[PDB]
Amino acid sequence: TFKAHVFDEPMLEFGDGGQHCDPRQGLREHGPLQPRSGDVIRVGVIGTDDTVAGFTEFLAETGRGIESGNKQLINLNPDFPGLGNQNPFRCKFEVPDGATVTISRRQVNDITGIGRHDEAVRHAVELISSQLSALVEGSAKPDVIVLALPIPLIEKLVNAKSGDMLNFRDLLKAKTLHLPVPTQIVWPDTWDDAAKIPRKIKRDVKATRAWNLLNALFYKAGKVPWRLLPDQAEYRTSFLGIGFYRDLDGQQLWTSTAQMFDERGRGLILRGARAQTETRGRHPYLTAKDAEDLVVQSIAAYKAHHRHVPARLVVLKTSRFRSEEAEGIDAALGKSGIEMSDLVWVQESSPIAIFRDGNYPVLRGTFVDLDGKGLLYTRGSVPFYGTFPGLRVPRPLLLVPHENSDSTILTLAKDVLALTKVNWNTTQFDQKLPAPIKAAREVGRILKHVEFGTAVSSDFRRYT
C-alpha cells in the first residue's frame, strides 16, 4: 500500500510552441508566449534624485548583460543576456522623459521625523499615493511604476527581525487599488522586492535579481512570458482559490475572497459575502447561498476577461469544504454548465512526511497516495537546479479531494504541482504553494484596509 509516484517537472509553453521547465531557460530560447514587434514597457520611477539615477544605471547595466554570480550552479544563477539580440523578454524596458517624480529631502526627513509609526506610515502613503495618482493621470502614460525609496525611508517604514501595527506596503496597495498601473517597490541597492517581508537589521545574486525585477515588470505590464502546457490543447482548465480574511475593525468579522487563475497565470480577485464562524469568531466558513453567489460571481468574472468557457474548473481551499460550502459550489457549477468540476482541500500544515536515506531531501514532484489523500512535495530536491534551494527541510502538502470531484487525485496532484510555477515574485519555479493559495494571503493583507461594500478591482496585477 501507499504507492509513490514521482511526477515530471511540469512543462511550460513558450514562444512558437517551445517547451521547457525553467522560466528563464525557456524564455532564453523561445521568448514570451506571444511576441509582438516593437513591444515596449513604459517604466515610471519615483524616488530621490540618487535612487532614480541608480535605477537608470541598473537598467543600463541590465541591458548590457550581467554575468552569473556562481558558475557552478548556472541553472539556478544564470547569466542575464541583456537587452538586445539575446534579450529573453524581447521587449524594451524604457524610462521615458517626464515619467519621473522625486521625493524631496524635506519630505523624506518629514516622514522619518514622525515618532508615531502608525502616524508616519499614514503620512508617507498619503504622500506617495498622491504621487502615483499624479503620475497615472499624467501624459507620461506609464505601464508599470517602480518605487525606489531610499534606505533611511525604508527602514522607518519596514520593521525588522533577527495586526497591532500598520504595514506600509499593504496600506499603499489598498489606497492605489483603484489606480490601473501596477507598482513595484524595490530596494535601491539590490533591486529586489521590498516591504513584502520584514527587513534584516544587518542587511549587508545580481543577475538573478535582475531577471526577477524584469519578470515582475513584464507581468505587471500585462504580458505573459509563458502558459502552463495543458494536458489537452482543446481542454481549458481554470483554478479558483477561495480564502477568508478577518477585518480588524468593527465586529472583527470575516470576509470571503476568490482567487481566479487561468492557464496563463492571470488572476481575477473578488470579494464575497461575510463569512460565518464555527466557534468564537475563528473557523471561518461560508453558507450554501453565499458560496453559490461567490462562485457565480467568479465564473462570470472569468468569462468576461476570456474567450473560451473552461471545460473543467478546480476549486481550492486551505480549510476543509463544509457540506454547506460544497453544496453551493456544486450548485453553481451545475448551473454554469461546466463539464468537469473538482474540489480540493490543500492542507499546508500536515505533520505527515516521508524521509529518504541521505542528507538531500526527496525529489520535488514526489507523490504518495494515502487512500484518497495525497501527500505532495512542492518543494524539494530539484534536478535542474542540481541541489535543494532551501535549507530547512520541506513540509509537504496533504491534498484531500472532495467526493464531488471528478478527477483522480493523481491528475489533481499534477495540477497543484504545476500551479506552483505561476510565480509573480521570482523566476525560481520551486514554490511551495499553488498560485490561488499564494494570492489568497496577499489579498487578505490588502483588502482588510478597504471597507466592505466598496468596489474592488479584479486585476491581480494591481495587488502584486
Binding site: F2, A4, P351, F355, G358, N359, P361, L363, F384, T387
Partner: protein
C-alpha cells in the same frame, strides 16, 4: 536482475579504460557520465560527457543538453543526435574533445532511475477490539478531576465531553467509578466511536489516543499542554541523558537531553498527532525540541533558542529522530493480576520511489552539499 549483470560487465571494461587516462565514471542498460581530471591537481575539471555502455526506446538524456556517446561491446570480442573508430585509449584524447563545456546553462543533471526507499512518520495503531462508554454527571474531564482524585487507583487515559465517558479500560474497576454513572456503563465495538464520521466522536477518539499514549510512555516522556508536545524528561539538574534504541538492525543512542554552558537544556521532543486514512488509525511523529532553564524549569525566552532549531532541521537529522520515536512507541506496547499496555504500534512498509536523488554525484558537483547536513552547534 538478469539484465543488470549483462550491463555491468560492459560498464566495467570501458570504466577501466577511462580511469587509465584519469577520467571519471559514475553510474546514472547502463548510463554514465565522464569527468576529466587535471594531472597534478587530481581534481575534477568540471568537463562532463555522457556515456552509455551497451553489450523510441531512446536515452532519457533527451532533455539533457549534454553530448551523448554510445559504446558497443560484446561478450566475446557520438550519438548526440537523437531520432525516433574504437575504444583503444588513443580514442580517449579524441573523445575528450566532445566536452559538455562544463556548467553551461541548460545542463540537466538528471535523476537516477534505479529507485530508492523512504520511510514515513506514520505508525499503524492496533486498538483494543472494544471500548467502554457511559454517561457522567460531569460536563467535561476538568470538572471530574476533583472527584476522581478523592479515590484510589487513579488513571487519566479517559475522556469526558458533553457528559459522555469513553475509555479503553473498564471504568468500574478504578476510581473512575465515581465519575461515571454506574448503571450506564457498557462495552461496545471500538469501531462505533473511532471509525464513524461524527466530528465529536472523531475528536473524542483523538483525545483518548493522546491520553493513552501519554500514560503508556510516562517513564521516558513528559506531556506539556502548550503545543501538546511530548518531550524526553530529565533526571537530575543540568545533567545530560542518553536514550538507547534500535535503528535498522543496529544499536545506537541519542543525547535526548543536551546542555551548553557559558544556561539552558535541550530536550528531544515530538508532536504526536493522529491521522485516520482508510479505516485504520495512525500515529504521526513530528520531531521538534523543547528547551528548559535547568532540566525542569521552563525557559524564560524561547525566541533566542528557536533560531538554532532551524539549523538542525536537516533530512538525515530528522529522519534519525523519527526512527528513534517509532522505536520508543512500538516498544511501549509490549508484554495474571496486573494491567498491560492497551495500544500497540506497527511500523509501515518502506515507501518505494521510482527515481532517486543522485546524492553521490551531487555531493561532488554541488558547492552547497555540506550545508545539507545538520551541524550541532
Amino acid at each position: 536482475t538478469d539484465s543488470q549483470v549483462l550491463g555491468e560487465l560492459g560498464e566495467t571494461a570501458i570504466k577501466k579504460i577511462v580511469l587509465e587516462t584519469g577520467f571519471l565514471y559514475e553510474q546514472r542498460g547502463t548510463d554514465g557520465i565522464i569527468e576529466l581530471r587535471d594531472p597534478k591537481s587530481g581534481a575534477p575539471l568540471g568537463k562532463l560527457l555522457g556515456v552509455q555502455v551497451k553489450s523510441d526506446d531512446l536515452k532519457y538524456w533527451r532533455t539533457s543538453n549534454i553530448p551523448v556517446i554510445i559504446v558497443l561491446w560484446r561478450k566475446s570480442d557520438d550519438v548526440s543526435d537523437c531520432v525516433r573508430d574504437v575504444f583503444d585509449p588513443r580514442s580517449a584524447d579524441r573523445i575528450g574533445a566532445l566536452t559538455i563545456d562544463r556548467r553551461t546553462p541548460g545542463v540537466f543533471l538528471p535523476p537516477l532511475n534505479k529507485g530508492e526507499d523512504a520511510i514515513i512518520n506514520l505508525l499503524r495503531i492496533r486498538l483494543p477490539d472494544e471500548i467502554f462508554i457511559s454517561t457522567s454527571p460531569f460536563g467535561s474531564g476538568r470538572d471530574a478531576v476533583p472527584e476522581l482524585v478523592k479515590h484510589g487507583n487513579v488513571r487519566f487515559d479517559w475522556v469526558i465531553r458533553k457528559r459522555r465517558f469513553v475509555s479503553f479500560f473498564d471504568p468500574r474497576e478504578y476510581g473512575t467509578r465515581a465519575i461515571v454513572d454506574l448503571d450506564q456503563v457498557e462495552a461496545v465495538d471500538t469501531k462505533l466511536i473511532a471509525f464513524n464520521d461524527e466530528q465529536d466522536d472523531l475528536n473524542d477518539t483523538m483525545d483518548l489516543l493522546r491520553r493513552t499514549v501519554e500514560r503508556q510512555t510516562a517513564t521516558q516522556l513528559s506531556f506539556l499542554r502548550k503545543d501538546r508536545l511530548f518531550h524526553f524528561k530529565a533526571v537530575g539538574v543540568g545533567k545530560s541523558r542518553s536514550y538507547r534504541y534500535m535503528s535498522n538492525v543496529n544499536e545506537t543512542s541519542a543525547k535526548v537531553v543536551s546542555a551548553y554552558s557559558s544556561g539552558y537544556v535541550r530536550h528531544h521532543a515530538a508532536r504526536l498527532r493522529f491521522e485516520r486514512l482508510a479505516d485504520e488509525w495512525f500515529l504521526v511523529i513530528d520531531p521538534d525540541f523543547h528547551f528548559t532553564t535547568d532540566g525542569f524549569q521552563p525557559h524564560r525566552y524561547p525566541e533566542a533558542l528557536l533560531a538554532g532549531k532551524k539549523r538542525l532541521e536537516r533530512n538525515a537529522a530528522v529522519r534519525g529522530q523519527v526512527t528513534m520515536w517509532q522505536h520508543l512507541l512500538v516498544e511501549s506496547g509490549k508484554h495474571a493480576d496486573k494491567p498491560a499496555p492497551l495500544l500497540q504500534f506497527e511500523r509501515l512498509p518502506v515507501i518505494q520511489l521510482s527515481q532517486a536523488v543522485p546524492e553521490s554525484s551531487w555531493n561532488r558537483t554541488d558547492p552547497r552539499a555540506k550545508e545539507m547536513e545538520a551541524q550541532d552547534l
